[PDB]
A paper describes a structure:
CRM1 (chromosomal region maintenance 1) is an essential nucleocytoplasmic transport receptor that mediates the nuclear export of a wide range of proteins and ribonucleoprotein complexes. CRM1-mediated transport is dependent on the cooperative binding of the small GTPase Ran in its GTP-bound form (RanGTP) and of the cargo protein to the export receptor, forming a trimeric complex that traverses the nuclear pore complex. The overall architecture of CRM1 consists of a ring-like structure that is composed of 21 HEAT repeats, each consisting of two antiparallel α-helices, A and B, connected via a short linker loop. The NES peptide contains four or five hydrophobic residues that bind specifically into five hydrophobic pockets (Φ0–Φ4) located in the cleft between HEAT repeats 11A and 12A.
Structural analysis of several inhibitor compounds bound to CRM1 revealed that their mechanism of action relies on the covalent modification of a critical cysteine residue (Cys528 in the human receptor) located in the nuclear export signal-binding cleft. This study presents the crystal structure of human CRM1, covalently modified by 2-mercaptoethanol on Cys528, in complex with RanGTP at 2.58 Å resolution. Recently, we conceived a crystallization approach that allowed us to gain structural insight into the cysteine-mediated covalent inhibition of human CRM1 by the classical nuclear export inhibitor LMB. However, when the same method was applied to crystallize a novel inhibitor compound known as C6, the obtained crystal structure revealed the unexpected covalent modification of Cys528 by BME, which became an obstacle in obtaining structural information on C6–CRM1 interactions. The observed shift corresponds to a Cys–BME conjugate, revealing the covalent modification of Cys528 by BME, known as a DeStreak modification. While the disulfide bond fits the electron-density map, the freely rotatable methyl hydroxy moiety was not visible in the density, indicating that it is most likely to be disordered. Ran is bound in the inner core of the CRM1 toroid and its binding is stabilized by the acidic loop, which is arranged in a seatbelt-like structure. The NES-binding cleft, with BME covalently bound to Cys528, is in an open conformation when compared with the unliganded cleft of ScCRM1 in complex with Ran and RanBP1 (Cα r.m.s.d. of 1.545 Å for the cleft residues 509–576 and the corresponding residues of ScCRM1). The reactivity of both the cysteine and BME is most probably induced due to the higher pH of the crystallization buffer.
Author numbering:
A (entry chain B): 6 to 179
B (entry chain A): 8 to 388, 402 to 1033
The structure:
C-alpha cells in the first residue's frame, strides 16, 4: 500500500460547481454560496482503496475568463482531468469542447471524465439525450450532483481504476 | 521566495533574472499554499505586462527548464492575440521569422520531437495565432510555402500537418466568440480557396510515405478537415479506398482511420449512393480480418489494452452511424444481405460489452431499427423490411430483456436540516437509458407478442429451476416485464399477467429466507404497479392487492415497507376512482374501509412512510366528485394528525415551554409534513383542513421563529447547527410549504385574499423583519412569491405592507457583496418578479424615490454572477420596460428619468466577460430599447439637446460611453457598432452576434484599419 499521487485538473465554466464538489469531498459540507475561484487552488484529496491509498492533487481552476490566471499553464504535467458543466445551463455544455480543446492540446493522452453537475434540479435544461460530446473524444461521462450526493465518487473511481491499471479497484472507508 | 524578491521580475529596468524566473515558475508547479499563490500572482502580472514579450528571447535562450520556456511562449501568444495590429510592421516580420525559425529548429531536433512535444505544440499554436490575425493579406504565400517546405523535408512535413490541423480547428471549429463574423468568414473562404494544394500533400503522403509517424499525423489532420472540406474531395477521389486498404487494417493506424470512415459515414447526401455502398462493403471486408465474427467482444473489451477498448467503441460508432444514415442502401441490394446480417452480428456482439457508454451507442441503433420496422408496419405475428430482419429480431428482444436498466432511482439525501430523506431522481442518464430500452422493447413487442412472451416465459423458467437465479437476474426480468405494459391487447395481457403472477407466487413459495421473499414480493409489487389497466378491470384482484400491501406495511424487513408504500401511491393515483364508487359486490366504497383502519395500517411505519401513505389516500379522496361527501372524508382522513395536533396546542396554551421540547417539536414537524402531502394530493378542497389549523399553526411558527432568533442572539449560528434548532426550522419550513402548497392549488382567489393572506403579516412577514439576520427564513420570500403569482390583482393592494416587512431588511443583507445569503438573493428577486409580473400597479402607486430603490435593486440583480439571480433580474427589467409602455402617462417620464441610466448598466454587463451567459437577454433588452427610439419616444432623452432627435442623441451618448470605457477602440469601430444597434434591432440572433463581435474587438487593439469584408 504505497502512496501514489496524481495531478488532477478540474476545469469548466464558472458556477458549474467545481469548487463545491471538491469542498464536499474534502469536508462533507455543501457550500451554497458562489465564490469564484481566482486562478487555481490546489487541494489534496485522499481516497482509501482496497489496494492502498490514492491521493489526487486537484488543481481547481477558475472558469471565469477575468480570473483565468495562467489558464492552460496550470495544465502542465497533469495526469488526469475532470471537465464540469451545469445541466441547468446550456452555455456550459456548449463551452465543454473549448475546455477539452485547451486541455488535450497540453496533455494529449490522459484519462478525462466529463461530468454534468446539478442533476438534482428539477428544471433540467441539458437533456440526457443531448450529451454526446464525450463519445468521439473517448471520455467517460457521469451525471453527478454535488448537492444530492448523486454519483459523487464515480469520477474519482474511474480515474483511479484507469491510473492504477486495476479495473476492480474499489473505494473503502478508512 | 519573499514576495518583494519575486516582484523583482516586474521591474523592467533591470535585466531579467533568469534564475529567479525559474524559481517562481518552479514555485508555480511544485510549491504549496501562499508561496504558490504569489508565484501565480507575479507570473500573471508578468504575462500581462505590455512589455513582457521583449524578454521572451532571453527566456528561451537562457532558461534551464521547459516549464519556464512554455511560460515564455504563453507571453508571446498573449501579445499576438491582444496587440498584433498595433505592433510596428517591422517587429511583426521579426516575430514571424523568429517563430518559423524556432519551429524549424525544434522540430528538426529528434530529442525534441520525442520528449518536448507539448512545447512543440505551443510553438505551433503561436504560429496559428499569427495566421488568424494576418495570414491571407500579410502572408499570401503561406500555404504554398508550408506545402513546399513539407515536400522538401519529412520532419517539417510531420509538424506542418499539426499546424494545418490547428489552423483548421481555429477557423472551422472554434471561431465563435474568438473572432468576428466577418474575419471568420474571410478565414474560412481563404482556407477553402487554397485547400487543393493541401489536399494534394495529404494524398501524396498517404499514397507514398513509409514514415509511420508522418502518416499518422496526416491522418489526424485529415480527420479535422473532414468536418468542412467539399464532398468532392471525400467521395470523388480514392480517399475511401485508400483509408480502407492502406490504413484500416494496420494496428497503429486502425483508430484514426476508423474515425475518419465514421465522419464519411455520417454524411447524408443522395449523390454518392455507390460510394457509401463501397465504404460499407470494403470496411466489412477488413473487419472480418481483424475481428472475426466468432470473437467474444465482451471478453476482448474486458481484457483489452487501451486502444483495443477505443477500437471497439469506434466500431460501434461506425456501424451505428453508417446504418442509421444508409441502411436502406444496403437493404435494397440482395447480394449484400449476408454482409448486412454480419453487421447486425457485430452490433449484437458489441452490445455485450459491459460499459454503459458503448451500450448506449448500440442501443441508439437498436432503437432506430425498431422504430423503422414499426413505422413500416405496427402489426403482430409480413412487410418487406421486417422480412430482412426477422432472422435476428429475436436477438434484439432477448438483448433488451436481458439488460433492462433500473426504471426508478431512489436516493438518501440530507436536507438543510440534517434529516436523511428518501427522494427519487428525475430525468437522469440512467433513467433515460431505461426509457430508450423500454421504447425499443415495446416496439419489438408490437411486431411479435409471442416472441416477447416466449423469451420472458423462458427467463422465468430459469428463475424457477435455479439455473439463472439471483436477486440481480430476477430484478432485470421483472423490470423488463413491467417495461412492456400497454403493448399487448387487454385480452393477451390478462392471460400474460396471470401466468407471470402465478409463477412468481410459486417462486415465493419455493424460496426460503426473509431476504428472498422480500426480493420476490418487491418484484411482484413492482409488476402489478405497472399494470393499472388490469387492476381496473378486476376489482377482486385490486382489493386483494391493496390488502396485501397493507400487510406488507407491518413487515419491517429492510425495503419491504418502502415498496408497499411506493406501490400503494402508484395504485392510488392510477386507480383512484375505484376507491370512491361502490364496487360491485361491495357495501361501502373502499375509501371508507381504509379511513376506518388507518390507525392499524400505519402503526408500524416510519414517519416518512406515513407521509407517503397519507398522500396516496389523498388522491382517492381527491376523486370524490360530491363536495359535502368529500368534506366528511377529509374530516375523518385528518383525524389522527388532528388529535396529536390539538393535544400539543392545548399543552402550548397551558405553557408555551413544551414548544421547546425535542419530542413535541419533531412531532409538530411530522404532523405538518402530513398536512403538506395531503394538500398536494387533495388540492383546493383541503381548505377545510387548512382552515381548522391555520391560526394555531401561525402562532407556533411565531414562537419557534422567536426561539431561533433568540438562540442565535445568545450563541450565534453555531447554535443553528444544533438538533433542536434544526427541528424548529423544519416546522417553519413545513408551515410555509403548507401555505404555499395550498395557495398554489386554490381556485377561489377572492377567498384566499380575504381569508388567508391577512394573518401572514404579523406571524410571518413582520416576524421575518424582527428576526436577527441569520434567523430570517429565506422560504418566506418564496412563499410570498408563490402567493403573488396566484392572486395577482387580489393582492396588489397589500404589496405596500409586504415590502415594508421584507423589501428593505432583505436588500440590506444582500447589498454588501454578491455572495452572502444566496437563497435570500434568489427568493427576494423571485418575489420582486412576481410583483412586477402580476401586480404592476403597486409600482405606480409608490413615490419616485421608492420606485428608484426598486430599479436599483433590479439593476443589482443582473450584475450578479449567480446566473439564476442575474437571469431573473434581466427578465424583471424586460417585463418592467413592457409594463411602463402600457400607459403613455408614466412611460415618457420613465424614459426621461431612467432610459439612459438603464442603458449604461446594461452596457457594463454586456461588455464584461463574466456575464456572457446573459447574452440572449442582453440582446433582447438592448434591441427593444433601441427599437423604441427608432420608432418614436415623445420626450427628449436629453433635456437640453432640444435639437438632437432622440436617435441622434442616443448614437452620440452610447458612442461616447463606449469611447470612454474602452479608450483603445478606434472611432470607426465605435460608429459601426452603434449603427448596428439600430440596424439589427429586429433580429435578436444577429444582434446577439453583433454584441459578440464587439466583445472580441474590446479585448484587442486595432490600429487605423478594419475588417471590412
Ligand atoms: N442545486 C445544486 N447546486 C449546486 C450543485 N453543485 C454546486 N451548486 C451550487 O452552484 C454554485 C457553484 O459554485 P462554485 O462551485 O463556487 O463554482 P465553480 O464552478 O467552482 O466556479 P469558478 O470557481 O468561478 O470557476 C454554488 O452556489 C453551489 O452551491 C449541485 O449539485 N446542485
Ligand atoms: Mg471554483
Amino acid at each position: 500500500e504505497p502512496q501514489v499521487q496524481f495531478k488532477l485538473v478540474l476545469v469548466g465554466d464558472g458556477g458549474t460547481g467545481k469548487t463545491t464538489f471538491v469542498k464536499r469531498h474534502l469536508t462533507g459540507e455543501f457550500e451554497k454560496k458562489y465564490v469564484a475561484t481566482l486562478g487555481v487552488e490546489v487541494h489534496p484529496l485522499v481516497f482509501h482503496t482496497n489496494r492502498g491509498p490514492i491521493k489526487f492533487n486537484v488543481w481547481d481552476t477558475a472558469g471565469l475568463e477575468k480570473f483565468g490566471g495562467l489558464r492552460d499553464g496550470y495544465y502542465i504535467q497533469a495526469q488526469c482531468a475532470i471537465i464540469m458543466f451545469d445541466v441547468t445551463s446550456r452555455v456550459t455544455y456548449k463551452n465543454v469542447p473549448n475546455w477539452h480543446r485547451d486541455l488535450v492540446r497540453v496533455c494529449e493522452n490522459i484519462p478525462i471524465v466529463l461530468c454534468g453537475n446539478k442533476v438534482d434540479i428539477k428544471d433540467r435544461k441539458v437533456k440526457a439525450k443531448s450529451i454526446v460530446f464525450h463519445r468521439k473524444k473517448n471520455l467517460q461521462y457521469y451525471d453527478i450532483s454535488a448537492k444530492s450526493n448523486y454519483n459523487f465518487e464515480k469520477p474519482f473511481l474511474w480515474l483511479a481504476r484507469k491510473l492504477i491499471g486495476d479495473p476492480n479497484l474499489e473505494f473503502v472507508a478508512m | 521566495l519573499a514576495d518583494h524578491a519575486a516582484r523583482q521580475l516586474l521591474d523592467f529596468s533591470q535585466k531579467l533574472d533568469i534564475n529567479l524566473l525559474d524559481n517562481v515558475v518552479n514555485c508555480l508547479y511544485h510549491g504549496e499554499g501562499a508561496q504558490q499563490r504569489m508565484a501565480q500572482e507575479v507570473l500573471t502580472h508578468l504575462k500581462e505586462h505590455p512589455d513582457a514579450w521583449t524578454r521572451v528571447d532571453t527566456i528561451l535562450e537562457f532558461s534551464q527548464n521547459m516549464n519556464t520556456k512554455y511560460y515564455g511562449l504563453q507571453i508571446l501568444e498573449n501579445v499576438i492575440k491582444t496587440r498584433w495590429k498595433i505592433l510596428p510592421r517591422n517587429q511583426c516580420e521579426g516575430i514571424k521569422k523568429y517563430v518559423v525559425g524556432l519551429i524549424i529548429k525544434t522540430s528538426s531536433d529528434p530529442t525534441c520531437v520525442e520528449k518536448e512535444k507539448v512545447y512543440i505544440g505551443k510553438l505551433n499554436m503561436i504560429l496559428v495565432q499569427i495566421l488568424k490575425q494576418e495570414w491571407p493579406k500579410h502572408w499570401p504565400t503561406f500555404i504554398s510555402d508550408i506545402v513546399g517546405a513539407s515536400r522538401t523535408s519529412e520532419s517539417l512535413c510531420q509538424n506542418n500537418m499539426v499546424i494545418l490541423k490547428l489552423l483548421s480547428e481555429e477557423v472551422f471549429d472554434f471561431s465563435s466568440g474568438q473572432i468576428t463574423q466577418v474575419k471568420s468568414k474571410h478565414l474560412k473562404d481563404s482556407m477553402c480557396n487554397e485547400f487543393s494544394q493541401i489536399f494534394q500533400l495529404c494524398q501524396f503522403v498517404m499514397e507514398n510515405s513509409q514514415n509511420a509517424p508522418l502518416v499518422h499525423a496526416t491522418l489526424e489532420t485529415l480527420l479535422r478537415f473532414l468536418n468542412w472540406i467539399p464532398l468532392g474531395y471525400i467521395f470523388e477521389t480514392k480517399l475511401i479506398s485508400t483509408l480502407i486498404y492502406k490504413f484500416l487494417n494496420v494496428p497503429m493506424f486502425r483508430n484514426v482511420s476508423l474515425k475518419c470512415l465514421t465522419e464519411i459515414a455520417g454524411v447524408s447526401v443522395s449523390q454518392y449512393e455507390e460510394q457509401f455502398v463501397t465504404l460499407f462493403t470494403l470496411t466489412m471486408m477488413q473487419l472480418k480480418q481483424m475481428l472475426p465474427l466468432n470473437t467474444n467482444i465482451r471478453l476482448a473489451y474486458s481484457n483489452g489494452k487501451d486502444d483495443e477498448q477505443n477500437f471497439i467503441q469506434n466500431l460501434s460508432l461506425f456501424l451505428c452511424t453508417f446504418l442509421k444514415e444508409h441502411d436502406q442502401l444496403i437493404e435494397k441490394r440482395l447480394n449484400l444481405r449476408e454482409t448486412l446480417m454480419e453487421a447486425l452480428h457485430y452490433m449484437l456482439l458489441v452490445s455485450e460489452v459491459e460499459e454503459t457508454e458503448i451500450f448506449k451507442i448500440c442501443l441508439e441503433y437498436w432503437n432506430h431499427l425498431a422504430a423503422e420496422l414499426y413505422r413500416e408496419s405496427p402489426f403482430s405475428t409480413v412487410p418487406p423490411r421486417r422480412q430482412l430482419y426477422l432472422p435476428m429480431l429475436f436477438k434484439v428482444r432477448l438483448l433488451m430483456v436481458s439488460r433492462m436498466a433500473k426504471p426508478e432511482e431512489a436516493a438518501a439525501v440530507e436536507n438543510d436540516q440534517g434529516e436523511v430523506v428518501r427522494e427519487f431522481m428525475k430525468d437522469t442518464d440512467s433513467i433515460n437509458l431505461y426509457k430508450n430500452m423500454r421504447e425499443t422493447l415495446v416496439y419489438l413487442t408490437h411486431l411479435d407478442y409471442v416472441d416477447t412472451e416466449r423469451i420472458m416465459t423462458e427467463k422465468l423458467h430459469n428463475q424457477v429451476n435455479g439455473t439463472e437465479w439471483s436477486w440481480k437476474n430476477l430484478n432485470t426480468l421483472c423490470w423488463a416485464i413491467g417495461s412492456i405494459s400497454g403493448a399487448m391487447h387487454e385480452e393477451d395481457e390478462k392471460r400474460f399477467l396471470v401466468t407471470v403472477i402465478k409463477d412468481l407466487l410459486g417462486l415465493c413459495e419455493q424460496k426460503r429466507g426473509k431476504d428472498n421473499k422480500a426480493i420476490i414480493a418487491s418484484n411482484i409489487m413492482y409488476i402489478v404497479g405497472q399494470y393499472p389497466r388490469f387492476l381496473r378491470a378486476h376489482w377482486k384482484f385490486l382489493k386483494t392487492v391493496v390488502n396485501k400491501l397493507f400487510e406488507f406495511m407491518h413487515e419491517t424487513h429492510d425495503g419491504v415497507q418502502d415498496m408497499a408504500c411506493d406501490t400503494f401511491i402508484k395504485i392510488a393515483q392510477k386507480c383512484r376512482r375505484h376507491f370512491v364508487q361502490v364496487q360491485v359486490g361491495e357495501v361501502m366504497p373502499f375509501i371508507d374501509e381504509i379511513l376506518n383502519n388507518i390507525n392499524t395500517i400505519i402503526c408500524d411505519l416510519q414517519p416518512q412512510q406515513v407521509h407517503t401513505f397519507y398522500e396516496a389516500v389523498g388522491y382517492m379522496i381527491g376523486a370524490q366528485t360530491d363536495q359535502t361527501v368529500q368534506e366528511h372524508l377529509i374530516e375523518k382522513y385528518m383525524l389522527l394528525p388532528n388529535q396529536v395536533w390539538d393535544s400539543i396546542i392545548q399543552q402550548a396554551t397551558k405553557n408555551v415551554d413544551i414548544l421547546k421540547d425535542p419530542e413535541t417539536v419533531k412531532q409538530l414537524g411530522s404532523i405538518l409534513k402530513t398536512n403538506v402531502r395531503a394538500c398536494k394530493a387533495v388540492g383546493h378542497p383541503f381548505v377545510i383542513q387548512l382552515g381548522r389549523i391555520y391560526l394555531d399553526m401561525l402562532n407556533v411558527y411565531k414562537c419557534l421563529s422567536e426561539n431561533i432568533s433568540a438562540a442565535i442572539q445568545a450563541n450565534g449560528e453555531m447554535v443553528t447547527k444544533q438538533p433542536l434548532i434544526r427541528s424548529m426550522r423544519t416546522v417553519k419550513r413545513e408551515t410555509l410549504k403548507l401555505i404555499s402548497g395550498w395557495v398554489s392549488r386554490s381556485n377561489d382567489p377572492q377567498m384566499v385574499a380575504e381569508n388567508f393572506v391577512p394573518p401572514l403579516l404579523d406571524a410571518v412577514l413582520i416576524d421575518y423583519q424582527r428576526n436577527v439576520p441569520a434567523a430570517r427564513e429565506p422560504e418566506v420570500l418564496s412563499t410570498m412569491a408563490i402567493i403573488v403569482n396566484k392572486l395577482g390583482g387580489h393582492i396588489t393592494a397589500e404589496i405596500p405592507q409586504i415590502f415594508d416587512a421584507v423589501f428593505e431588511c432583505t436588500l440590506n443583507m444582500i447589498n454588501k457583496d454578491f455572495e452572502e445569503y444566496p437563497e435570500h438573493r434568489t427568493n427576494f428577486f423571485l418575489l420582486l418578479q412576481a410583483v412586477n409580473s402580476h401586480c404592476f400597479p403597486a409600482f405606480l402607486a409608490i413615490p419616485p424615490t421608492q420606485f428608484k430603490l426598486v430599479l436599483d435593486s433590479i439593476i443589482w440583480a443582473f450584475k450578479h454572477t449567480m446566473r439564476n439571480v442575474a437571469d431573473t433580474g434581466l427578465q424583471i427589467l424586460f417585463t418592467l420596460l413592457q409594463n411602463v409602455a402600457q400607459e403613455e402617462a408614466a412611460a415618457q417620464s420613465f424614459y426621461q428619468t431612467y432610459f439612459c441610466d438603464i442603458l449604461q448598466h446594461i452596457f457594463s454587463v454586456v461588455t464584461d466577460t463574466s456575464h456572457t451567459a446573459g447574452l440572449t437577454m442582453h440582446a433582447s433588452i438592448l434591441a427593444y430599447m433601441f427599437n423604441l427610439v427608432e420608432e418614436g419616444k415623445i420626450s427628449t432623452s436629453l433635456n437640453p439637446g432640444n435639437p438632437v432627435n432622440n436617435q441622434i442623441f442616443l448614437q452620440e451618448y452610447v458612442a461616447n460611453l463606449l469611447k470612454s470605457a474602452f479608450p483603445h477602440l478606434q472611432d470607426a469601430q465605435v460608429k459601426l457598432f452603434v449603427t448596428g444597434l439600430f440596424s439589427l434591432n429586429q433580429d435578436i440572433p444577429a444582434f446577439k452576434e453583433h454584441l459578440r463581435d464587439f466583445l472580441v474587438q474590446i479585448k484587442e487593439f486595432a490600429g487605423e484599419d478594419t475588417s471590412d469584408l
